Symmetry: D2
Subunit: 456 residues, 4 copies
C-alpha cells in the first residue's frame, strides 16, 4: 500500500471525524508539525515539503483517471474542463463548446494545451473523501483543481489567487516560481489577480522543480507560474480554501445588523443630522478647517465605536456556519458510522413485502459526525441546518434545515457539543420523555444521528 | 395686508436666498426666537404658539383654493386627495376611484368625511414658494398636507408620524391632543405608527383648541389626534420635514464603504478568521466559558471602533446632498433674480425672426440662488447636480446634472462658496480665458447663474 | 373673424358631438366634399387644396404661441421638442439634454435648425379641441406635430410615415415634394422608413409651394420632403391618424382567440399530428415529392380557413374600442354640455359651509354627455364601461379607466349609448326597478358621463 | 430468456435505428398489428392486451430495482418520488421533505401509501433504452412513471391525463376501471383533470384485473382508477407520449407568422379598417341588422382563409422538431454503433502519453450515428443542426444544443440526414471543395453524430 491508501484505511478506523481531519492534515504536510505550520507559516510564507517519496499520493488522482472520466462521464468544456496555453506571452483559451470527449481533450493536449479539471471531487470518490475530511479542520470550504500540462509548455500566465493553495505533485515534474506580494495592498489579496506578463514580476522567493510526492503551499496574493521541462509532462492537484474568510468579511455582515439594532434600541442613533452639515461636509469642503467639521467627524467616531455594543456576533457566526454547511461536501461515512445509522438499517423482505427499528429511552446516541449540522436562529425561530443531503457538485443543492422548537433547544445543543460522547435518549434535557424520543427519532431518521449498537 | 403677504413681499427684496430662508422661519414661529427653538425644543418637546392674530396666514391656502383646485385641475382620489372619517374608534377610508370632482368631494365632506390634499405645492404657487424657501434652512425636503374637517367630527385615528410636524391653523378651530412618546423606542420614531385606539393612550402632554394663525409643533413619535367641535369646521396645513435624516441613516451609508476601504488599506482587516471559531461562537455556544470567546468578542469591538478611521464622511455627505437636490422643490425666483437671468433675457418675434447678447470677461455674476446646485465626485468625475429643472411634483423629474471638467473645478467651487458675492467672469480661476467664458456661459444658459446687470 | 375662429364658434352651437366632428372635417378639406375624399382619395392619392385664403387657420397655432410655451411651460428637448437639420445630404439632430428655454431653441433656430413640437395638444387648448373633435370622425386617435423651419434650409431628410398625414400650412411658404410609393411593399406602409437620400427617389407625383391656408394630404407610404425658400420661414401643423388601424392588426388579435376557441370546442383541432410528419415537412424536405406533404399542406390551409367560424369578432372590436378610448384626448365640452352636466353644477355655500346638497328624479331627461366618450366591454365574464372623461391631454399619461356595469343594468346602458343625442327619461330606463333605475343614472351623471335637459342647479 | 431481454438482444443486431423502433413497438403490443392499432384504436379507444405470459416484461423494472435505487441514488421526495393514498374519497399526499431513504419510503408503503417514481429512465438503463427507442416511432417525447401500490389500497383518485398512456403490468395484479370521455369537450383533453369523486363517474367502459405481462392502453381524456385487491401488491410502468402534439398546437405557432407575412406581402392586409365599424360591431351591437355588419363579418372570414397561403409550414415543422430534439432522451448505441464512432475510438492513456491517437479521409465511408439524433433548422437567415447526443436522461436538464451549418454545407448535410442508413464516401459529399467535404465530415464525427463503415483505428 502507498502512504495515501494507508492513511485513508486508517481514517476509517478513527471514530471521531474531528480527529480524522486533524490526522489527514498531519499526513498532508508530514513531517512538518501542524502546530508549527499554522503558528508561523499559514498566511505568512511559501512552504516547500520535499517528500523523498514518489508514491506518497498514489491512489489520489491520475491521468488514467482523467481519461476514464472523460469517457464514462459527461464532462463539459468550460463547465468542468478548461483547455489553455500560455504561448508568446499571451494566455489562450481553446475551449470548444460541448462535451469533452477523450479524442477532443487529447488532441488539445497534443497541441500543447494544459487541461484543468474544475471539480474532480464530483467525479472521484477519493478526492471527495480527501476534501470532505480536510474541510473539517480548515473550517472553510476546501476545493480542488487538477492540472495536466504537456511536455515543454506552460498552460497559464503568472498570477496570484484569492485562496490559500496547497499544490500536490502527482505525476512528472514541473518548474515552479513563487513570488512574494508585490505591494502592501497585494498581501493576502481579496480577489484573484488578472494575467500578468513577465515584466510585471520581480525575483521569485522560491524557484524549484516539484516531483511526485512533494507539496508546495503559498498564501493568497503570492504570484506564481509553472512550466514543464523537456519530455516530461506534469499532473498536480491544487487544494484551495479560505476564500473570503476574513475578519473584514465578518464585519461586512455584522455592521448593517449592528446599526439597525442601535437605531431601534438607542435614541442617540435616532437623532436628526445637523440642519447645515451640508455647508461644511462634502468634497467641496475637504480643505476647510471649519470647527464644525471636527465636531461632526468626532461624533461619527463615537457613534461608530458604540456600535460594538450592538453587534450580534453569535448571529453572524451562525450565518457564516450556515453558509459553510451549504458549501460543504456531503460526508464520507466510515463502515461503523454507516452500520450504526439509518443508512445501514436493513429492510427485511418476506413474501415480496418489506417487514420493518425503534429508539427507546435506553438507546445511546450521538451526532453522525461533528461537522454536518448547525443550530441557527432566524426570524425568532431555531433551525438545524445540515450537509447530509448536499451534492458533490458545488451548490447544486439548496440549504437544507429542519425546525427546532424552543423546548428541544437544550437537548439539540447538548448533542452538538458533546460529540463523540454517547448519551442516552433518556438523559436528554427535555421536559418530557415523549419529547426525548421525538427529537432523537427525528434526527435519526434524517441521517444525523447514530446509535451505539445497530437498532436492527 | 396680512402678515404672510407682508413677509413674502419683504422676501422679494432680500438679495440672499439663505437670508430669505432664515427670515421666513423666524416669521413662521414668531415671536419665539429660532435659536431657542432649535436649541431646546426641536426634536425634544411639543410647542404651541398662540399667535393672537387670525389673519397671520391669509394668502397661504383656503377652502376656496381647494374648491377651485378640484374644478380646474385633475385632482385624483388616492393619488392627490383622501377622504376619511374616524367613527366608533375605527378608521374609515371612503375613497371613490377616479377623479375628485367638487360634487363628489363636497358630498363626502357633508357625510362627515375629512379631506386631505397630499401635495398642495403642486397646485398652489404660494405653498410652493413657502416650502421651497423653508427647505433651504431645514437642509431637508419640506412637504405638506392640507386637512379639511367638517363640523362635529374627526377624520383620523390617533397616531404618530415619522417626520417633524408644524401644524398651521388656517380656518376655524380644532381640538388637538398631543402625547409624549409612550416608550423609549417610540421617541423620535423611525417609521409612522399604525392606528391606535383610545385605550393605547394615556394623558396628553398638551390639549388645546387651535384657532386661525396658531402654530403647533411636535417631534416624530409624539402621538396626536384632533377633532372639530359643534358649529365650526377646520382647515389646516401641516408642514413636514426630516424624514429619515438621522445619524443612524448617515451611518448605514458610511459603514459598508468604511469596511471596504479598511480591507483594501489595512492588512489586519484582510487576515483570515480562526479556523475553529465556530467551536465557541454562535447561539449554540452563548454560554461557553472558553476564553477564546471573550477574546473574539473583544477583537470585533475594537475592529468596529477602528472602522471610523476609514469612513468616507465627505463622499457620503455629497450623496445625501445629491439626494436632497433630487428631492427639492424647484426655486421660486424673486422679481430681480428673474430679471437678471436667462429666464429674463428678452426674446421674441421681431421682423418675423428671433431678436436674440453674450457675457464678457467684465461681467459680474453669482449663483442664481444658494441651494440649487451641488458638486459631487462620482467614479473619478466631477458632476454638478441641480434643482432648477425639478417638478413641483415629488420625484417626477429624474436626477439632473452637468459634468464638470478638472480645469473648471476650482472655478465652480469658488462660485458655490462665494454666494451671494458678485464676481467678474475674468476673475474665475481657469486655465484660459476661453474657459472662464465657457463655464460662465454654460451655467447662465442652464439657469444657474445671474448677472450684475441685464445682459440685454 | 378668421374662418377657423368662425367654425369653432359655430361648433359650440352644434348639439351633437357626431355632427360636430363631421362639420369640422368638412371645414378642414373645404371646398372638397368629404364623401368624395374618403371614397376615392383616402389611402389612395396625395391631395392638395389651394385655399386662396391666407387667414384660413388663423387662431390655431402660431410662432408666437411656440415662443410663449417655451417661456411658460416645462418644454423638454427630445421629450417635447426636437431640433433637426438636414445638410450635405445628411440628417443631423442637435437635441441638447434638459429643458428647452426660449434662448436655446431660438439659438438653434438661428443656426438653421428646424424645431418640431411633438404634442401641441398638451399646450394649446385650440389644438386640443381641433384634435378632440376630429378623432371622433376618424374612429382612430388623432395626433399632431408642429414644424418651424428657418429660411433657406431643410430640417428633415426625405422619408415616409406610418400614418395618414394632413399638412396645414400656417405661416410663410415651403416647397413640398410628394412621391408615390416606390415599391408595392411600401404602399400603405406599417412602419416608418429610415432616412432616404436623393438617389433613392424618383419623380414627384406632386410638387408645390404651400402658402398659409393650404392643405396637403398624403397616405402612409408616400415619401415626402420639404425645404424653405429664401428669406421666408415656414410653420405648419401635421395632423396624423390611423396608426396601426389595419385589417391585419384586427386579425392579429382575433387569431390567437380563434384557435383557443376552436381547440376547446371542436375535437378535430385537438387531434394528434401524424407520428412521422417530420419525415416530409421542414426545410430539409422542401424538395420532397412525398404525397403526404401536399396532403399536410392542404390540411393546414383548411384548418386555418375554419378558424373564421370561431373568430370572436365582436369581442376584438370592443377591445380595439377600449384601446381607442385609452388613446383618446379628453372631450372638449360646449357651453351647453358643461351647463347641463356635473361639471357645471354649482355648489351653494352658507356660513362657510357647502349646503348645495340636487338629486335626479325619475322624471329627468338625460343622454350621454357626448357620443364618443364611453364603450361597454365584456371581460372575464363581466361588463365594464370604459370612458375618456378622465384622460389627460398627454398621450397615455392616464391608465385605462372604467366602472363595472352589473347584468341588471346592461340593457339600460346600451339604450343610452345607442340613442344619443335623444333625451331619455330616467323612469323609462329598462331597469330591474326604480331603485336601480335611479342608481345607474346617478352614477353615470356623477362620473361626468351624462347630462340633463335642465340644469339641476342654476349658476 | 424473457421476451423482453430477447427483443433487446435482437435490437442490438438491427442496423437501422428506425427499424429498431418499429420492431420494439410491434413487440410492445404483440400480437396486435401496429398498422391496425394506429388506424383504428390510437386516440380512439381503450385497448386491453391479454399477454398470457407473466414473464413478458422481465428485466424492465422491479421492486428490487426501486429498493436498490432508494439505497444507492439520491432519490428526493417530490422531485423524484411521490407517496400518496386515496382514503375516504379524498386524495392525500404524504411527501415528507428531503431525501427518500429506504426506511422512509418503505414505512409509507407499509402505511398504505402508493409510491410513484417520476423519472425511472434517469435511474434505469433498461427503461432508458426502452423509451429512447420508442420516442423515435412516436415522433414525440416518451416519458414514464412507475407505480408501486401496497396490498388492499388505492393510491390515487379517479382522473384523466393529458397524454396517451400505455400501462405495463410488471408485478402482482390490479383492478382497473377506464371510462369513456364524459363529454365532447373532454374527448382528447388538452390538460390534466382535477381529482374526481366517484359521484362524477358513470359506468366503466373497461373493467379488468391486470396481470404481469398485460398491456392497457387509453387516450388522453379517458378517466381511470385502480386498486389492489386483498392480497397482493401491484407494480406497473406507465409509458406516456403525445403531450400537446395536436393540429391546434401546430396552428398556434403558425398563425402569428402567417399574418406577419400576409401584412408584409399583400396590401389588402395593410388597408385601413372602416372609420365607423365601431358603430355596428361589438357586444352592444350583436343584435344589429346593419348590412355593414354582414359585410364586415364576411371580410374577416375571407382574409382569414387567405392566411393559409402565407403559412410557413416548414418553418413551424422545424421549430417543433427542434423542441422534440430538446425533449429527447440521448441515444442508446448498439455495440456496432459505439465501435464505429468517436465514442469507441481507442485513445487511451499509456506510456505517459496518448496512445492510438486516426483521421477521416475522402475514402472514409460514413452515415449518421442513428436516424433520430439531429435536425437541420433555419433560424434568422441561418442554418443550425440541432442534436440530442449531449442530452441528459433528466428532462430539460441540458439546454438546446446545435452547431451552425454554413450555406455551402447545406446540401451535404441534407444528403447525410436523408440517406441513412446508406453509407456515403466523404469524397462523394456534394461540397464546393475537397477541404469542405473533410471539414464537415470531421466536425460531425467529432461531435458524435457520425459513424464510419470500418473503425478509424485499424
Ligand atoms: O500549473 C499551472 O500552470 C498553473 N497552476 C495554478 O495556477 C495553480 O495550481 O493554482
Ligand atoms: O387633522 C387630523 O385629524 C389629523 N392630522 C394629522 O395627523 C396631521 O396633521 O399630521
Ligand atoms: O417639414 C419638414 O421639413 C418635414 N415634415 C414632415 O416630415 C411632416 O410634416 O410629416
Ligand atoms: O395506479 C394508480 O393508482 C393510478 N395510475 C395512473 O393514474 C397512471 O398510471 O396513469
Ligand atoms: Mn493559480
Ligand atoms: Mn399626523
Ligand atoms: Mn413626415
Ligand atoms: Mn393517470
Amino acid at each position: 500500500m502507498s502512504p495515501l491508501r494507508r492513511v485513508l484505511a486508517e481514517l476509517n478506523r478513527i471514530p471521531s471525524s474531528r480527529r480524522r481531519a486533524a490526522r489527514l492534515f498531519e499526513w498532508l504536510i508530514a513531517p512538518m508539525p501542524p502546530d508549527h505550520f499554522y503558528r508561523r507559516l499559514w498566511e505568512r510564507e511559501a512552504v516547500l515539503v520535499r517528500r523523498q517519496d514518489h508514491t506518497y499520493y498514489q491512489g489520489l488522482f491520475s491521468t488514467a483517471d482523467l481519461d476514464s472520466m472523460l469517457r464514462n462521464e459527461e464532462v463539459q468544456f468550460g463547465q468542468h474542463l478548461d483547455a489553455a496555453r500560455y504561448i508568446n506571452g499571451r494566455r489562450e483559451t481553446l475551449n470548444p463548446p460541448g462535451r469533452a470527449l477523450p479524442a477532443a481533450a487529447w488532441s488539445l493536449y497534443q497541441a500543447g494545451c494544459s487541461l484543468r479539471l474544475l471539480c474532480p471531487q464530483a467525479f472521484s470518490t477519493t478526492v471527495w473523501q480527501f476534501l470532505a475530511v480536510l474541510q473539517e479542520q480548515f473550517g472553510s470550504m476546501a476545493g480542488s483543481n487538477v492540472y495536466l500540462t504537456p511536455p515543454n509548455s506552460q498552460g497559464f500566465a503568472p498570477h496570484y489567487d484569492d485562496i490559500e493553495a496547497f499544490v500536490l505533485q502527482l505525476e512528472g515534474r514541473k518548474l515552479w516560481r513563487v513570488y512574494r506580494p508585490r505591494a502592501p495592498t497585494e498581501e493576502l489579496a481579496l480577489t484573484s489577480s488578472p494575467n500578468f506578463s513577465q515584466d510585471d514580476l520581480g525575483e521569485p522567493v522560491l524557484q524549484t522543480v516539484l516531483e511526485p510526492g512533494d507539496l508546495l503551499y503559498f498564501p493568497r496574493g503570492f504570484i506564481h507560474q509553472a512550466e514543464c521541462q523537456d519530455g516530461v509532462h506534469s499532473l498536480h492537484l491544487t487544494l484551495s480554501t479560505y476564500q473570503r474568510n476574513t475578519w473584514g468579511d465578518f464585519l461586512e455582515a455584522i455592521l448593517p445588523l449592528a446599526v439597525q439594532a442601535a437605531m431601534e434600541e438607542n435614541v442617540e442613533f435616532r437623532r436628526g443630522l445637523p440642519r447645515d452639515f451640508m455647508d461644511y461636509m462634502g468634497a467641496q469642503h475637504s480643505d476647510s478647517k471649519d470647527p464644525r467639521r471636527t465636531a461632526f467627524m468626532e461624533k461619527v467616531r463615537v457613534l461608530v465605536a458604540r456600535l460594538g455594543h450592538f453587534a450580534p456576533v453569535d448571529a453572524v457566526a451562525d450565518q457564516r456556519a450556515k453558509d459553510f454547511i451549504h458549501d460543504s461536501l456531503p460526508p464520507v461515512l466510515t463502515d461503523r458510522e454507516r452500520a450504526l445509522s439509518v443508512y445501514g438499517l436493513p429492510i427485511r423482505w418476506e413474501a415480496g413485502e418489506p417487514v420493518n427499528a425503534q429508539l427507546t429511552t435506553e438507546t445511546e446516541v450521538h451526532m453522525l459526525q461533528d461537522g454536518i449540522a448547525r443550530l441557527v436562529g432566524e426570524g425568532g425561530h431555531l433551525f438545524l441546518y445540515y450537509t447530509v443531503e448536499n451534492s458533490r457538485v458545488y451548490h447544486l443543492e439548496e440549504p437544507k434545515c429542519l425546525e427546532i422548537y424552543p423546548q428541544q433547544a437544550d437537548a439539540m445543543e447538548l448533542l452538538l457539543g458533546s460529540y463523540p460522547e454517547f448519551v442516552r435518549v433518556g438523559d436528554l434535557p427535555c421536559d418530557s420523555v415523549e419529547d426525548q424520543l421525538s427529537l432523537a427519532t427525528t434526527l435519526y431518521d434524517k441521517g444525523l444521528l447514530l446509535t451505539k449498537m445497530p437498532l436492527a
